[PDB]
């Protein structure tokens, strides 16, 4: 059982590390929209530009 118990903790480490691999992806996307936002708060953009920005 202890040999079996060791493997599951290893498999459990895989699943935990797997999910955090996706969480890294989303944070890169969320921070891109965040930096995309602060450019859209600028005052020299026409309506088409902020509409084009919205599409991405």
């Amino acid at each position: 059982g202890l040999r079996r118990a060791e493997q599951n903790t290893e498999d459990g480490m895989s699943l935990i590390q797997t999910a955090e691999g996706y969480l890294q992806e989303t944070h890169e996307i969320v921070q891109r929209v965040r930096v995309l936002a602060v450019q859209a708060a600028n005052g020299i953009y026409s309506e088409e530009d902020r509409q084009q920005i919205q599409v991405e």
């Binding site: 691999g21 996706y22 992806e25 996307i29 920005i53 599409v55 991405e56």
Partner: protein, 56 residues
């Protein structure tokens, strides 16, 4: 046709033989480039989209 340079049905395109029509073409070009810029902003979103998908 989708740009506005040529009539899709009549199959004739804009002429610049007179001064008055030229300032009307100025607006079309702003619209035509608005059409193109929007699509490239679409494809730029597609181009960025895959990289976020690929990395994960």
């Amino acid at each position: 046709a989708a740009l506005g340079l040529r009539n899709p049905t009549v199959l004739t395109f804009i002429s610049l033989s007179t001064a008055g029509k030229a300032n009307s073409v100025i607006g079309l070009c702003d619209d035509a480039l608005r059409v193109i810029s929007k699509q490239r902003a679409d494809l730029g979103a597609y181009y960025n989209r895959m990289e976020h998908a690929a990395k994960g």
